[PDB]
Amino acid sequence: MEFIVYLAGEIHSNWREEIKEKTKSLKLPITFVGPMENHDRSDNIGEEIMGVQPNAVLKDDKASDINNFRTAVLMNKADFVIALFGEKYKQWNTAMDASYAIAKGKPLIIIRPESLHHPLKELSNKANITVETVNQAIKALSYLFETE
Amino acid sequence: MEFIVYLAGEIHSNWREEIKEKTKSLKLPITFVGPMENHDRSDNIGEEIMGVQPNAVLKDDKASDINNFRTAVLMNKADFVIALFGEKYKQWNTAMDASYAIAKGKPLIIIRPESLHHPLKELSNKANITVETVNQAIKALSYLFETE
Amino acid sequence: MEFIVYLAGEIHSNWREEIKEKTKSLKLPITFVGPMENHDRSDNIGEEIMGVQPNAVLKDDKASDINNFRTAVLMNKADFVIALFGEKYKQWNTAMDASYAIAKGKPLIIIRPESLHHPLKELSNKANITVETVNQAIKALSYLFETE
Amino acid sequence: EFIVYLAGEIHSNWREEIKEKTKSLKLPITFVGPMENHDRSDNIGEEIMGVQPNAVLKDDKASDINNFRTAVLMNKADFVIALFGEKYKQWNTAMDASYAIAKGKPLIIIRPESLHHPLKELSNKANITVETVNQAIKALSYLFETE
Amino acid sequence: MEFIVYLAGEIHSNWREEIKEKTKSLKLPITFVGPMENHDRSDNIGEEIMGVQPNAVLKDDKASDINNFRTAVLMNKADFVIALFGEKYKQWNTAMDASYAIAKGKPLIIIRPESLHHPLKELSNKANITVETVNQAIKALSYLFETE
Amino acid sequence: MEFIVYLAGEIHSNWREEIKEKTKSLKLPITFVGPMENHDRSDNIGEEIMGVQPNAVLKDDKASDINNFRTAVLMNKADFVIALFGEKYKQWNTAMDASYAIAKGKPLIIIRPESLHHPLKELSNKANITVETVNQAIKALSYLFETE
Amino acid sequence: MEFIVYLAGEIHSNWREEIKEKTKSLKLPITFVGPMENHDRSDNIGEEIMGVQPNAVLKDDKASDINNFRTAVLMNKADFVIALFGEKYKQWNTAMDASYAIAKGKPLIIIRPESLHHPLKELSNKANITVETVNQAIKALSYLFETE
Amino acid sequence: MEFIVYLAGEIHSNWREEIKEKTKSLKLPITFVGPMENHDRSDNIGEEIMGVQPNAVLKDDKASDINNFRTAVLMNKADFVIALFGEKYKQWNTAMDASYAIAKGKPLIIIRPESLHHPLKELSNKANITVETVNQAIKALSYLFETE
């Protein structure tokens, strides 16, 4: 069968592309989905679609109307979820998608550097797998389909 | 990936054909489903399948037997829902479909003229996206498959 | 045992007090919950908590945050739902709540005048019981506990 | 009776304000939440199952117990109040609010307007986003108000 | 710890009194609920509330609106179900309720005379316990609370 | 837009082939599933697989182990259900399958002669559509994909 | 608030009594439920209630009808579960109950000696808490109500 | 119409390839999934992905992070489950996956020697089908698709 996998995380690095390229090398039957990766497009889609809001709290809420729509639709298609944390930014959006995955019973892989273990401890304790590198998560993905 | 989208709303006007045409113009992988769009067919289907009924309430209730079957079966295929409100007709069928999507965790876009913001304020507050025109909806549909 | 019943509908008339009085007159083990029945309080609760807003759509949305929080919390306590429709106002909020109850499997009584049956036909077809008056709904409530 | 989970950082005593103000109004709400003693909460893992080979494992075994307690009390809660501050990563707070949204429990978020952007997706999914406890209390009183 | 138990079956005889009597002799913490047991009232309750119907099919459907509302509400309170089949009548309603219990994860005891084993074979195979008499179902209920 | 449909009802006669042929002629995107239609094989599959049993109850229960396995696996594939009742045989299995469909939210069509309206009143009341004939059911299936 | 806790594990010893007294000593708001603790009674209840059976397998199956009924009813009351494994007996029933609690979202504490960690690795990995002793379990229970 | 079937059981023997070969010879539309069948790979996958662990308990728990991830992901894909028990090894993981199938509504065939009926009585009572051999289980699989 084929798998759909949601990639939750901060869009500022190209961590997702790397996942997508190493997976294709191994020819795994996995299709990845996730949020809009352009940070500028993502912050402004609210005004782009529903007109320039007067204040900044309304500009973000309008953009979140659209981005939460995209996330809900793709998450509903996702068989399981991979969420990556990094040392920069609040990343409450990432914790939200990860916790959503767990709450809905979608298996979750968390990718995180060990130096962030303490603030992630409740979330990683709930995850199926916590690793520190994309390379480790790839090995977990390969093991899904291996025969020996 | 393919998506199935239920178009909820009044069948008196031909608003769904704008949505279908435009979406196909962008080649989004979206199949639309919805109610029987022929108002005279839809009102009379109960008496067409079963016979003429003793009175008007029972003519509507039999047509509803058939129409609520169609909408349940298609809505069960639907990944998300778009519901449009116009300024004519009671449209409690439209509110019932929108609120159903919400209740079942299907993402919901509402289309409604700003002039109807107050009678819809509870329902738009619960939907994922509330816009004013079909073109604004199309933009949100495209943002689902956009890379930038 | 005890039952919690959500009375959904127009807060412009006083049908709810009629249901509560006749239920207490029969001494049924039923408690009634429902929305804020003061329309001006309800329309304005958003500004009363979160301060006055830049426009009327935003003022209505903020009031809907609070009123949908009260509705959600109280619906989650309701064993079943009575929804009354009247001749005046869109009542898209009434259709919403009744549809919510159907979608969640909460038994539902609709009270509606025969003259609105056609616009309510799909929704009434889905409810457990549709009746024209409050006295009728009270007889179904009483039948719940009757022994002969 | 309503059981309400208070989610958020345990370093400060914001929960103490809500409980006191809610009791003044005589609202029929009973409050539940995590262990509020931070040192207890960080060491409960080692307290029950013994010292761990490293810090990660120390934090993991503590999460067994703390995630047990939260699951159990969350399962009793009718709805949730999550508070965010300017201090700490607060990923546990975001986890609990998201969990409430996923399970259809209504959610109030208390958060200062300065944190509006990092919280944008989360507050968008909450029922109510307010800035102060006093506003949350008004939403709560409104649950039982008649006029 | 108390339990609510729905007693589904033909109302045409008095098996439910035997169950309630023997349970109270044992002082078990169980409250029973069930359909209206006066057959003529149950048949006529549709017209009692919504007036004489145009034909017998409509008279039975209106009665079914009310009896199924009563069944849904009481069933929603019940922790588990006891369903009794006898030799008289079609009893398609009894199989409906028993099957409803199974589908909803409600433990089910079926009481049926061995004479009826073959037409009941699929249903009794899905029930937790299938016995021949009320006394056997009573011993099941006692075993729930026993200590040795 | 393919639909799997479970055909519940007595296996002694050949009503399913008429539905299957008439559907294929109209070219509807529907595949049908159902129980083993050979009555002798269906009564004996318990003893064929699990071996000769000591008595006729055990023979019927082992047959039901297998038949309820097949019904559950195919029911789980099914988008909706057609259940047909006739005048011969108990048909408690038909009531079981139809009630299961309704409990799990599968839309349901009941086909039953008007002379059986009374014993089936609760069950037809819960079904989406209750018709008298196979050709009526087909008209409802056609309506699913009709555009005008 | 009250908590109901299912105690799963072998019925050959009296480890449950240790849990019940130490929890009583501490005055925790916890009521414990569990299977019939008398093995001879537990093994023969099938024959006690239904006939003596043709063979050992049917004796065990009939006993399990009643025991799985008690388990399902009591489990349905339980907020969470404690399962204890020991060095004797197959204890597949124990693994059953623990897996069921995991699968239904019921928090689960597992007590197992370190010598059984390898054969229990999958199950303990899924549990909320794995400890070696009853005393460790009681510390987890007390942490539920502790204020410092 | 195709089915995915999880093969739960001990990964020391090759019982599974017997099921897969005979199924293929019969050309049934069934694709089988299951855990990693190589025992040494399975025990060490935790250290292989995540590094050598401080002790055997942690080596087993890291392996179980990975193995339970595989099991959750494939089980979410499975329509039904076949579990085989033999006389060797603790097989609590087999009981775990079998109970999981029951708890999630996935149909279940258990294969177990009659000599193990007593320790398996509760689990076997809840399975759809319990047989002694792979050949009997194949007769059940084939009955699923049979026309006579």
Side-chain angles (χ1 to χ4, degrees), chain B residues 61 64-65 68 90 92 96 99 104 117-118 121-122 125, chain C residues 60 64-65 68 90 92 96 99 103 118 121-122 125:
Chain B
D61 197 40
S64 287
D65 271 5
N68 283 341
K90 302 294 172 143
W92 293 321
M96 161 183 89
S99 175
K104 295 281 160 207
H117 77 85
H118 189 87
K121 61 180 174 132
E122 292 89 5
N125 181 254
Chain C
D60 281 358
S64 292
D65 280 346
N68 284 344
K90 295 302 181 323
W92 277 320
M96 194 174 81
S99 186
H118 187 258
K121 72 193 163 116
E122 290 94 359
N125 179 257

PDB file of all heavy atoms in Angstrom, chain B residues 61 64-65 68 90 92 96 99 104 117-118 121-122 125, chain C residues 60 64-65 68 90 92 96 99 103 118 121-122 125:
ATOM      1  N   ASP B  61     -41.626  15.239   3.006  1.00  0.00           N
ATOM      2  CA  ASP B  61     -40.968  14.241   3.834  1.00  0.00           C
ATOM      3  C   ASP B  61     -40.497  13.032   3.026  1.00  0.00           C
ATOM      4  O   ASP B  61     -39.497  12.406   3.393  1.00  0.00           O
ATOM      5  CB  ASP B  61     -41.926  13.806   4.948  1.00  0.00           C
ATOM      6  CG  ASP B  61     -41.217  13.104   6.080  1.00  0.00           C
ATOM      7  OD1 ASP B  61     -40.097  13.543   6.448  1.00  0.00           O
ATOM      8  OD2 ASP B  61     -41.770  12.104   6.586  1.00  0.00           O
ATOM      9  N   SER B  64     -37.583  14.170   1.022  1.00  0.00           N
ATOM     10  CA  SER B  64     -36.516  14.262   2.007  1.00  0.00           C
ATOM     11  C   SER B  64     -35.908  12.894   2.308  1.00  0.00           C
ATOM     12  O   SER B  64     -34.690  12.777   2.433  1.00  0.00           O
ATOM     13  CB  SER B  64     -37.062  14.920   3.281  1.00  0.00           C
ATOM     14  OG  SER B  64     -37.299  16.332   3.116  1.00  0.00           O
ATOM     15  N   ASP B  65     -36.743  11.853   2.428  1.00  0.00           N
ATOM     16  CA  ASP B  65     -36.240  10.476   2.473  1.00  0.00           C
ATOM     17  C   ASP B  65     -35.182  10.241   1.404  1.00  0.00           C
ATOM     18  O   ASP B  65     -34.104   9.706   1.690  1.00  0.00           O
ATOM     19  CB  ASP B  65     -37.397   9.485   2.279  1.00  0.00           C
ATOM     20  CG  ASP B  65     -38.074   9.081   3.587  1.00  0.00           C
ATOM     21  OD1 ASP B  65     -37.713   9.639   4.655  1.00  0.00           O
ATOM     22  OD2 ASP B  65     -39.009   8.232   3.526  1.00  0.00           O
ATOM     23  N   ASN B  68     -32.113  13.247   1.637  1.00  0.00           N
ATOM     24  CA  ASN B  68     -31.218  13.025   2.772  1.00  0.00           C
ATOM     25  C   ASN B  68     -30.398  11.748   2.599  1.00  0.00           C
ATOM     26  O   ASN B  68     -29.300  11.655   3.150  1.00  0.00           O
ATOM     27  CB  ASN B  68     -32.006  12.989   4.088  1.00  0.00           C
ATOM     28  CG  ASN B  68     -32.419  14.410   4.576  1.00  0.00           C
ATOM     29  OD1 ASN B  68     -31.854  15.402   4.153  1.00  0.00           O
ATOM     30  ND2 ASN B  68     -33.417  14.483   5.452  1.00  0.00           N
ATOM     31  N   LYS B  90     -35.018  30.441   2.768  1.00  0.00           N
ATOM     32  CA  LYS B  90     -34.748  30.175   4.180  1.00  0.00           C
ATOM     33  C   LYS B  90     -33.398  29.485   4.374  1.00  0.00           C
ATOM     34  O   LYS B  90     -32.659  29.817   5.306  1.00  0.00           O
ATOM     35  CB  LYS B  90     -35.880  29.336   4.777  1.00  0.00           C
ATOM     36  CG  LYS B  90     -37.273  29.980   4.655  1.00  0.00           C
ATOM     37  CD  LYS B  90     -37.374  31.271   5.490  1.00  0.00           C
ATOM     38  CE  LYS B  90     -38.674  32.019   5.229  1.00  0.00           C
ATOM     39  NZ  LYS B  90     -39.221  32.645   6.455  1.00  0.00           N
ATOM     40  N   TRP B  92     -32.389  26.648   5.498  1.00  0.00           N
ATOM     41  CA  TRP B  92     -32.052  25.832   6.654  1.00  0.00           C
ATOM     42  C   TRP B  92     -31.378  24.535   6.239  1.00  0.00           C
ATOM     43  O   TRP B  92     -30.642  23.951   7.036  1.00  0.00           O
ATOM     44  CB  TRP B  92     -33.296  25.548   7.476  1.00  0.00           C
ATOM     45  CG  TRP B  92     -33.795  26.789   8.082  1.00  0.00           C
ATOM     46  CD1 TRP B  92     -33.042  27.794   8.612  1.00  0.00           C
ATOM     47  CD2 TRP B  92     -35.162  27.202   8.188  1.00  0.00           C
ATOM     48  NE1 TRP B  92     -33.859  28.800   9.065  1.00  0.00           N
ATOM     49  CE2 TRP B  92     -35.165  28.461   8.814  1.00  0.00           C
ATOM     50  CE3 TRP B  92     -36.382  26.623   7.823  1.00  0.00           C
ATOM     51  CZ2 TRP B  92     -36.347  29.150   9.091  1.00  0.00           C
ATOM     52  CZ3 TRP B  92     -37.548  27.306   8.098  1.00  0.00           C
ATOM     53  CH2 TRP B  92     -37.523  28.556   8.724  1.00  0.00           C
ATOM     54  N   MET B  96     -27.946  23.265   7.904  1.00  0.00           N
ATOM     55  CA  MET B  96     -27.870  21.896   8.396  1.00  0.00           C
ATOM     56  C   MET B  96     -26.645  21.186   7.829  1.00  0.00           C
ATOM     57  O   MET B  96     -25.945  20.477   8.555  1.00  0.00           O
ATOM     58  CB  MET B  96     -29.154  21.134   8.031  1.00  0.00           C
ATOM     59  CG  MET B  96     -29.046  19.605   8.076  1.00  0.00           C
ATOM     60  SD  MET B  96     -30.600  18.813   7.531  1.00  0.00           S
ATOM     61  CE  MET B  96     -30.270  18.716   5.764  1.00  0.00           C
ATOM     62  N   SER B  99     -23.335  22.770   9.411  1.00  0.00           N
ATOM     63  CA  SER B  99     -23.165  22.388  10.804  1.00  0.00           C
ATOM     64  C   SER B  99     -22.861  20.902  10.923  1.00  0.00           C
ATOM     65  O   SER B  99     -22.149  20.484  11.839  1.00  0.00           O
ATOM     66  CB  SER B  99     -24.415  22.761  11.599  1.00  0.00           C
ATOM     67  OG  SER B  99     -24.330  22.297  12.934  1.00  0.00           O
ATOM     68  N   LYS B 104     -18.855  16.712  12.291  1.00  0.00           N
ATOM     69  CA  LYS B 104     -18.113  15.509  11.925  1.00  0.00           C
ATOM     70  C   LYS B 104     -16.635  15.781  11.660  1.00  0.00           C
ATOM     71  O   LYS B 104     -15.931  14.887  11.176  1.00  0.00           O
ATOM     72  CB  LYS B 104     -18.727  14.844  10.696  1.00  0.00           C
ATOM     73  CG  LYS B 104     -20.115  14.299  10.911  1.00  0.00           C
ATOM     74  CD  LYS B 104     -20.071  12.957  11.644  1.00  0.00           C
ATOM     75  CE  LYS B 104     -21.401  12.652  12.291  1.00  0.00           C
ATOM     76  NZ  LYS B 104     -21.245  11.752  13.485  1.00  0.00           N
ATOM     77  N   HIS B 117     -23.629  38.696   7.557  1.00  0.00           N
ATOM     78  CA  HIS B 117     -22.700  38.318   8.623  1.00  0.00           C
ATOM     79  C   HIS B 117     -23.420  38.098   9.952  1.00  0.00           C
ATOM     80  O   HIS B 117     -23.072  37.182  10.704  1.00  0.00           O
ATOM     81  CB  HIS B 117     -21.586  39.366   8.765  1.00  0.00           C
ATOM     82  CG  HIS B 117     -21.997  40.619   9.488  1.00  0.00           C
ATOM     83  ND1 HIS B 117     -21.984  40.728  10.865  1.00  0.00           N
ATOM     84  CD2 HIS B 117     -22.414  41.824   9.023  1.00  0.00           C
ATOM     85  CE1 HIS B 117     -22.387  41.938  11.216  1.00  0.00           C
ATOM     86  NE2 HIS B 117     -22.654  42.624  10.118  1.00  0.00           N
ATOM     87  N   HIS B 118     -24.447  38.908  10.256  1.00  0.00           N
ATOM     88  CA  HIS B 118     -25.068  38.774  11.573  1.00  0.00           C
ATOM     89  C   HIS B 118     -25.942  37.529  11.697  1.00  0.00           C
ATOM     90  O   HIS B 118     -25.827  36.829  12.719  1.00  0.00           O
ATOM     91  CB  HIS B 118     -25.837  40.045  11.942  1.00  0.00           C
ATOM     92  CG  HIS B 118     -26.309  40.057  13.362  1.00  0.00           C
ATOM     93  ND1 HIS B 118     -25.528  40.510  14.407  1.00  0.00           N
ATOM     94  CD2 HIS B 118     -27.468  39.631  13.918  1.00  0.00           C
ATOM     95  CE1 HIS B 118     -26.191  40.374  15.542  1.00  0.00           C
ATOM     96  NE2 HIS B 118     -27.376  39.853  15.272  1.00  0.00           N
ATOM     97  N   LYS B 121     -23.517  34.563  12.243  1.00  0.00           N
ATOM     98  CA  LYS B 121     -22.311  34.813  13.037  1.00  0.00           C
ATOM     99  C   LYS B 121     -21.873  33.570  13.816  1.00  0.00           C
ATOM    100  O   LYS B 121     -20.673  33.341  13.988  1.00  0.00           O
ATOM    101  CB  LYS B 121     -22.510  36.002  13.983  1.00  0.00           C
ATOM    102  CG  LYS B 121     -23.632  35.835  15.011  1.00  0.00           C
ATOM    103  CD  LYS B 121     -23.761  37.060  15.919  1.00  0.00           C
ATOM    104  CE  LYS B 121     -24.968  36.936  16.825  1.00  0.00           C
ATOM    105  NZ  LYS B 121     -24.609  37.261  18.237  1.00  0.00           N
ATOM    106  N   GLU B 122     -22.826  32.761  14.299  1.00  0.00           N
ATOM    107  CA  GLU B 122     -22.450  31.549  15.021  1.00  0.00           C
ATOM    108  C   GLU B 122     -21.835  30.527  14.075  1.00  0.00           C
ATOM    109  O   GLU B 122     -20.807  29.921  14.396  1.00  0.00           O
ATOM    110  CB  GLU B 122     -23.655  30.935  15.748  1.00  0.00           C
ATOM    111  CG  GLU B 122     -24.211  31.751  16.912  1.00  0.00           C
ATOM    112  CD  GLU B 122     -25.280  32.764  16.480  1.00  0.00           C
ATOM    113  OE1 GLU B 122     -25.658  32.772  15.276  1.00  0.00           O
ATOM    114  OE2 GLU B 122     -25.734  33.553  17.345  1.00  0.00           O
ATOM    115  N   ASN B 125     -18.340  31.615  12.679  1.00  0.00           N
ATOM    116  CA  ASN B 125     -17.377  31.453  13.762  1.00  0.00           C
ATOM    117  C   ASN B 125     -16.876  30.005  13.881  1.00  0.00           C
ATOM    118  O   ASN B 125     -15.700  29.787  14.190  1.00  0.00           O
ATOM    119  CB  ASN B 125     -18.018  31.942  15.065  1.00  0.00           C
ATOM    120  CG  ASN B 125     -17.097  31.837  16.258  1.00  0.00           C
ATOM    121  OD1 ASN B 125     -17.273  30.966  17.098  1.00  0.00           O
ATOM    122  ND2 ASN B 125     -16.112  32.730  16.345  1.00  0.00           N
TER     123      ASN B 125
ATOM    124  N   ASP C  60     -19.593  40.859  15.992  1.00  0.00           N
ATOM    125  CA  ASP C  60     -20.429  39.664  15.972  1.00  0.00           C
ATOM    126  C   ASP C  60     -19.593  38.402  16.177  1.00  0.00           C
ATOM    127  O   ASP C  60     -20.041  37.450  16.831  1.00  0.00           O
ATOM    128  CB  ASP C  60     -21.181  39.569  14.647  1.00  0.00           C
ATOM    129  CG  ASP C  60     -22.402  40.470  14.584  1.00  0.00           C
ATOM    130  OD1 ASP C  60     -22.723  41.169  15.574  1.00  0.00           O
ATOM    131  OD2 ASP C  60     -23.056  40.457  13.522  1.00  0.00           O
ATOM    132  N   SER C  64     -19.778  35.662  19.119  1.00  0.00           N
ATOM    133  CA  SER C  64     -19.966  34.267  18.736  1.00  0.00           C
ATOM    134  C   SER C  64     -18.921  33.357  19.376  1.00  0.00           C
ATOM    135  O   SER C  64     -19.227  32.197  19.671  1.00  0.00           O
ATOM    136  CB  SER C  64     -19.940  34.132  17.212  1.00  0.00           C
ATOM    137  OG  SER C  64     -21.080  34.749  16.623  1.00  0.00           O
ATOM    138  N   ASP C  65     -17.693  33.857  19.594  1.00  0.00           N
ATOM    139  CA  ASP C  65     -16.719  33.125  20.408  1.00  0.00           C
ATOM    140  C   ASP C  65     -17.336  32.694  21.733  1.00  0.00           C
ATOM    141  O   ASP C  65     -17.309  31.509  22.094  1.00  0.00           O
ATOM    142  CB  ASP C  65     -15.480  33.990  20.680  1.00  0.00           C
ATOM    143  CG  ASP C  65     -14.498  34.031  19.504  1.00  0.00           C
ATOM    144  OD1 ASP C  65     -14.606  33.206  18.563  1.00  0.00           O
ATOM    145  OD2 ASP C  65     -13.616  34.909  19.530  1.00  0.00           O
ATOM    146  N   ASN C  68     -20.763  30.526  21.304  1.00  0.00           N
ATOM    147  CA  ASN C  68     -20.436  29.161  20.895  1.00  0.00           C
ATOM    148  C   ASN C  68     -19.627  28.422  21.951  1.00  0.00           C
ATOM    149  O   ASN C  68     -19.625  27.184  21.954  1.00  0.00           O
ATOM    150  CB  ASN C  68     -19.678  29.139  19.569  1.00  0.00           C
ATOM    151  CG  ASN C  68     -20.576  29.394  18.383  1.00  0.00           C
ATOM    152  OD1 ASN C  68     -21.803  29.304  18.478  1.00  0.00           O
ATOM    153  ND2 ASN C  68     -19.970  29.729  17.251  1.00  0.00           N
ATOM    154  N   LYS C  90     -33.778  34.765  10.432  1.00  0.00           N
ATOM    155  CA  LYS C  90     -33.169  33.691   9.617  1.00  0.00           C
ATOM    156  C   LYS C  90     -33.266  32.413  10.450  1.00  0.00           C
ATOM    157  O   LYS C  90     -33.969  31.573   9.993  1.00  0.00           O
ATOM    158  CB  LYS C  90     -31.734  34.029   9.226  1.00  0.00           C
ATOM    159  CG  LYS C  90     -31.573  35.234   8.313  1.00  0.00           C
ATOM    160  CD  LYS C  90     -32.324  35.127   7.020  1.00  0.00           C
ATOM    161  CE  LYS C  90     -32.107  36.339   6.142  1.00  0.00           C
ATOM    162  NZ  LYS C  90     -32.028  37.584   6.939  1.00  0.00           N
ATOM    163  N   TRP C  92     -30.663  30.634  11.423  1.00  0.00           N
ATOM    164  CA  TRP C  92     -29.588  29.736  10.942  1.00  0.00           C
ATOM    165  C   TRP C  92     -28.853  29.167  12.151  1.00  0.00           C
ATOM    166  O   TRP C  92     -28.225  28.148  11.982  1.00  0.00           O
ATOM    167  CB  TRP C  92     -28.646  30.472   9.999  1.00  0.00           C
ATOM    168  CG  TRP C  92     -29.156  30.529   8.599  1.00  0.00           C
ATOM    169  CD1 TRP C  92     -29.793  29.534   7.922  1.00  0.00           C
ATOM    170  CD2 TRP C  92     -29.078  31.644   7.700  1.00  0.00           C
ATOM    171  NE1 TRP C  92     -30.110  29.953   6.665  1.00  0.00           N
ATOM    172  CE2 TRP C  92     -29.688  31.239   6.498  1.00  0.00           C
ATOM    173  CE3 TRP C  92     -28.557  32.935   7.790  1.00  0.00           C
ATOM    174  CZ2 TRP C  92     -29.789  32.074   5.394  1.00  0.00           C
ATOM    175  CZ3 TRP C  92     -28.656  33.765   6.698  1.00  0.00           C
ATOM    176  CH2 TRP C  92     -29.261  33.335   5.517  1.00  0.00           C
ATOM    177  N   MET C  96     -28.359  25.192  12.853  1.00  0.00           N
ATOM    178  CA  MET C  96     -27.043  24.740  13.290  1.00  0.00           C
ATOM    179  C   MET C  96     -27.135  23.793  14.483  1.00  0.00           C
ATOM    180  O   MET C  96     -26.598  22.681  14.456  1.00  0.00           O
ATOM    181  CB  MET C  96     -26.196  25.949  13.679  1.00  0.00           C
ATOM    182  CG  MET C  96     -24.727  25.645  13.820  1.00  0.00           C
ATOM    183  SD  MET C  96     -23.724  27.114  14.119  1.00  0.00           S
ATOM    184  CE  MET C  96     -23.982  27.336  15.886  1.00  0.00           C
ATOM    185  N   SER C  99     -28.997  20.423  13.749  1.00  0.00           N
ATOM    186  CA  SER C  99     -28.113  19.595  12.944  1.00  0.00           C
ATOM    187  C   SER C  99     -26.956  19.045  13.765  1.00  0.00           C
ATOM    188  O   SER C  99     -26.559  17.888  13.589  1.00  0.00           O
ATOM    189  CB  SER C  99     -27.586  20.417  11.770  1.00  0.00           C
ATOM    190  OG  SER C  99     -26.831  19.624  10.880  1.00  0.00           O
ATOM    191  N   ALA C 103     -26.009  15.088  14.190  1.00  0.00           N
ATOM    192  CA  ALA C 103     -24.696  14.581  13.814  1.00  0.00           C
ATOM    193  C   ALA C 103     -23.987  13.927  14.990  1.00  0.00           C
ATOM    194  O   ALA C 103     -23.188  13.007  14.798  1.00  0.00           O
ATOM    195  CB  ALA C 103     -23.845  15.707  13.240  1.00  0.00           C
ATOM    196  N   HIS C 118     -42.110  23.170   4.522  1.00  0.00           N
ATOM    197  CA  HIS C 118     -41.312  22.987   3.310  1.00  0.00           C
ATOM    198  C   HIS C 118     -39.855  23.426   3.498  1.00  0.00           C
ATOM    199  O   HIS C 118     -38.948  22.657   3.132  1.00  0.00           O
ATOM    200  CB  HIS C 118     -41.978  23.672   2.108  1.00  0.00           C
ATOM    201  CG  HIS C 118     -41.280  23.379   0.820  1.00  0.00           C
ATOM    202  ND1 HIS C 118     -40.424  24.274   0.216  1.00  0.00           N
ATOM    203  CD2 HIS C 118     -41.252  22.262   0.056  1.00  0.00           C
ATOM    204  CE1 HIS C 118     -39.917  23.734  -0.878  1.00  0.00           C
ATOM    205  NE2 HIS C 118     -40.398  22.509  -0.993  1.00  0.00           N
ATOM    206  N   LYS C 121     -37.876  20.774   5.585  1.00  0.00           N
ATOM    207  CA  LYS C 121     -38.222  19.385   5.272  1.00  0.00           C
ATOM    208  C   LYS C 121     -37.036  18.425   5.467  1.00  0.00           C
ATOM    209  O   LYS C 121     -37.215  17.337   6.025  1.00  0.00           O
ATOM    210  CB  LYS C 121     -38.806  19.263   3.853  1.00  0.00           C
ATOM    211  CG  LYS C 121     -37.840  19.440   2.677  1.00  0.00           C
ATOM    212  CD  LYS C 121     -38.610  19.608   1.354  1.00  0.00           C
ATOM    213  CE  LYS C 121     -37.729  20.184   0.245  1.00  0.00           C
ATOM    214  NZ  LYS C 121     -37.547  19.220  -0.861  1.00  0.00           N
ATOM    215  N   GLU C 122     -35.828  18.792   5.012  1.00  0.00           N
ATOM    216  CA  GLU C 122     -34.678  17.894   5.168  1.00  0.00           C
ATOM    217  C   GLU C 122     -34.355  17.697   6.639  1.00  0.00           C
ATOM    218  O   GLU C 122     -34.117  16.570   7.100  1.00  0.00           O
ATOM    219  CB  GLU C 122     -33.442  18.449   4.447  1.00  0.00           C
ATOM    220  CG  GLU C 122     -33.492  18.430   2.931  1.00  0.00           C
ATOM    221  CD  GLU C 122     -33.991  19.761   2.341  1.00  0.00           C
ATOM    222  OE1 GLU C 122     -34.314  20.686   3.126  1.00  0.00           O
ATOM    223  OE2 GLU C 122     -34.048  19.875   1.095  1.00  0.00           O
ATOM    224  N   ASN C 125     -37.010  15.698   8.542  1.00  0.00           N
ATOM    225  CA  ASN C 125     -36.872  14.289   8.192  1.00  0.00           C
ATOM    226  C   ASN C 125     -35.801  13.586   9.031  1.00  0.00           C
ATOM    227  O   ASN C 125     -35.908  12.373   9.280  1.00  0.00           O
ATOM    228  CB  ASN C 125     -36.566  14.164   6.700  1.00  0.00           C
ATOM    229  CG  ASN C 125     -36.370  12.722   6.251  1.00  0.00           C
ATOM    230  OD1 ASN C 125     -35.252  12.286   6.045  1.00  0.00           O
ATOM    231  ND2 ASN C 125     -37.458  11.992   6.075  1.00  0.00           N
TER     232      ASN C 125
END
